[PDB]
Design a protein around this ligand. Structure first.
Ligand SMILES: Nc1ncnc2c1ncn2[C@@H]1O[C@H](COP(=O)(O)OP(=O)(O)OP(O)(O)=S)[C@@H](O)[C@H]1O
Ligand SMILES: Nc1nc2c(ncn2[C@@H]2O[C@H](COP(=O)(O)OP(=O)(O)O)[C@@H](O)[C@H]2O)c(=O)[nH]1
Ligand SMILES: [Mg+2]
Ligand code: NA
Lengths: 204, 394
């Protein structure tokens, strides 16, 4: 018998390939970790990640909750967008609340405190490697210890699309599904998929 | 806009040592892809300004999307280059025109070949310094080919480009400084090389990643097609056990598909209530790979701690997770000289042929037949660290 050829299936375009690769990552974490969360901003990258998360589990809902670390106040059009988003998707959204000082106490500490209160061992961030220079040496999985800090020797080489999620009791990770996407990839994905977006068109 | 919607993705690795000119080359590529004014200078500066780190660089054209895997060329960063090489489609092996093929040229080539890179381009740089001497180019090409011959190093494409990263010759546009050169420029290669290298359209391998059970009547088996094409109604088998069923449906967010090819994130539904767990492979019933608990493999050791035969490790293949050990080391390959040598230990950055033993059998493929089902990582049971990259020989 003669095997099937590539001329039978539509070849993988860059966005479809990125889509599949990010879906795979999300599934792995879900498969290996007990209490994941999707850290959802109200911004554009987190909107792409949430769309990927849906695609990852269809026809099921997200097996993990979605989180928003709320500051004092963001744009009014963001709250209204996110509020409608929860009701229109039957979503489980957790809000948390307790730019030098501001961001440190509200975001950094807030997110830190939110992860402890619920007992999450994995957290989905929509950060990209092309967003800041340092991010170039970043991995998909970012291992944190009990007291929450990052240690170099605890980080693991990421070989193929095989990922090591073996973690200890009280240890948590940071996952970046979108790390291979570029600014152009995201907007191009938003446009083709028709992902709803906050009326403001400048990076939030 | 408009044309940028249907592009491919090519990941390529850059290999070379200090002062070969790779910061200049990468800088030139990242820059001249934007010119549809020496800003280039500041780009090259930034790039010039003990770790497991791989640098991932991003740029595109109208034709395709590019990810550059950048890693230092020193022996100490072999694991780093290995990590980078694992996802790459192509390697740029960078040589200085005055020095030609060196030990690092040989070492980088081996690593690329070992990790299944099917396309290499020997970038013979600084040809501007020798006056675009054809004799020098032909000298370097011939003795690289002689080296390649003594590895059984037969990638699907091997190109030799005479260039000047500094001056731009044959980097983006073809050069008038080399009328004797009939080949295409870099970039022309990078845009045009066929990446149907994921040859596996012939043999279905579906590693089961996630058992989706939303309600009592939908039972789905989610994962990514490593290889082959699955079709609604195909007779499949799982390779843990050998038991068979027919594919009921291919389920995605877009709906239900008749077929799906390699690299697609799908969910498979089955006609029979067959027992399928995460870790099992779903395969065509008329085309079944070997299933065993023992196999030969190449190992790239990447832990500070040495590897000890008999010591229990965890073997994560793709979604298959099975504890086991290395029974024996057949030989250790000296990365610089490319020859076999007996060993009873593997150190950091060392590569060798090993005999692997598992507690339970997995379905397997030679890494040279399948880049997914022939690839695995070794995991330390006490430290949780990823200590070695493995690729099956069969
Ligand atoms: N307040 C927050 N609550 C929850 N998740 C957050 C918060 N801030 C950032 N994140 C996550 O961390 C990533 C970094 O945020 P950003 O780089 O600002 O991207 P974004 O907010 O999704 O898109 P922008 O701001 O419109 S370019 C996002 O993908 C979020 O998922
Ligand atoms: N003449 C000439 N000089 C080059 C070429 N490529 C790089 N150089 C020079 O060699 C020096 C080191 O180059 P660099 O890119 O930093 O090498 P790296 O250490 O591999 O990053 C710089 O002064 C470059 O201008 C070339 O093709 N021709
Ligand atoms: Mg934002
Ligand atoms: Na962002």
């Amino acid at each position: 018998l003669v095997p099937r050829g590539s001329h039978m299936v539509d070849k993988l375009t860059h966005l479809k390939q990125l889509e599949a690769e990010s879906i795979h990552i999300i599934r792995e974490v879900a498969a290996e970790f007990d209490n994941p969360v999707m850290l959802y901003s109200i911004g554009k990258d987190s909107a792409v990640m949430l769309h990927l998360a849906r695609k990852a589990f269809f026809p099921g809902k997200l097996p993990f909750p979605v989180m928003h670390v709320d500051t004092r106040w963001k744009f009014q059009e963001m709250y209204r967008f996110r509020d409608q988003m929860v009701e229109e998707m039957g979503l489980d959204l957790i809000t948390h609340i307790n730019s030098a000082k501001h961001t440190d106490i509200m975001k950094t500490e807030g997110l830190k405190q939110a992860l402890d209160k619920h007992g999450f061992d994995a957290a989905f961030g929509g950060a990209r490697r092309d967003e800041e220079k340092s991010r170039a040496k970043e991995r998909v999985y970012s291992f944190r210890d009990s007291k929450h800090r990052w240690d170099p020797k605890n980080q693991r080489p990421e070989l193929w699309n095989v990922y090591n999620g073996n973690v200890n009791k009280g240890e948590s990770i940071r996952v970046f599904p979108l790390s291979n996407w570029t600014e152009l990839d995201i907007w191009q994905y938003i446009y083709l998929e028709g992902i709803p977006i906050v009326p403001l068109y400048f990076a939030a | 806009l408009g044309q940028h919607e249907r592009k491919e993705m090519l990941r390529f690795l850059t290999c070379g040592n200090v002062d070969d000119g790779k910061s200049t080359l990468i800088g030139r590529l990242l820059h001249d892809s934007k010119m549809i004014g020496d800003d280039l200078a500041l780009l090259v500066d930034g790039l010039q300004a003990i770790t497991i780190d791989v640098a991932y660089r991003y740029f595109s054209t109208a034709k395709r999307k590019f990810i550059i895997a950048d890693t230092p060329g020193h022996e100490q960063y072999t694991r780093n280059m290995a990590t980078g090489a694992s996802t790459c489609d192509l390697a740029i092996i960078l040589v200085d025109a005055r020095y030609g093929v060196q030990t690092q040229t040989r070492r980088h080539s081996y690593i690329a070949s070992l990790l299944g890179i099917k396309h290499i381009v020997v970038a013979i740089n600084k040809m501007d310094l020798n006056g675009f001497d054809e004799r020098v180019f032909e000298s370097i090409k011939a003795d690289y080919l002689k080296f390649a011959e003594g590895i059984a190093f037969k990638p699907t494409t091997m190109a030799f480009v005479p260039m000047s990263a500094l001056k731009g010759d044959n980097v983006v546009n073809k050069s008038e400084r080399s009328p004797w050169y009939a080949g295409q420029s870099l970039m022309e290669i990078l845009e045009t090389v066929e990446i149907a290298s994921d040859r596996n359209y012939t043999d279905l391998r579906f590693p089961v990643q996630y058992v989706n059970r939303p309600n009592l009547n939908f039972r789905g088996f989610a994962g990514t097609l490593a290889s082959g094409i699955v079709h609604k109604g195909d007779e499949i088998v799982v390779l843990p056990s050998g038991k068979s069923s027919r594919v009921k449906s291919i389920v995605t967010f877009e709906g239900e598909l008749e077929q799906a090819g390699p690299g697609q994130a799908v969910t498979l539904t089955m006609e029979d209530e067959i027992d399928i767990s995460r870790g099992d492979l779903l395969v065509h019933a008329d085309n079944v790979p070997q299933v065993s608990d023992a196999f030969d493999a190449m190992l790239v050791w990447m832990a500070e701690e040495p590897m000890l035969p008999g010591k229990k490790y965890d073997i994560k293949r793709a979604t298959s997770y099975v504890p086991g050990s290395i029974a024996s080391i057949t030989h250790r390959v000296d990365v610089n000289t490319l020859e076999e040598g007996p060993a009873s230990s593997l150190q950091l950055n060392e590569i060798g042929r090993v005999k692997v033993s598992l507690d339970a059998p997995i379905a397997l493929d030679g890494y040279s037949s399948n880049r997914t089902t022939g690839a695995f990582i070794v995991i330390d049971r006490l430290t949780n660290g990823t200590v070695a990259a493995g690729m099956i020989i069969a």
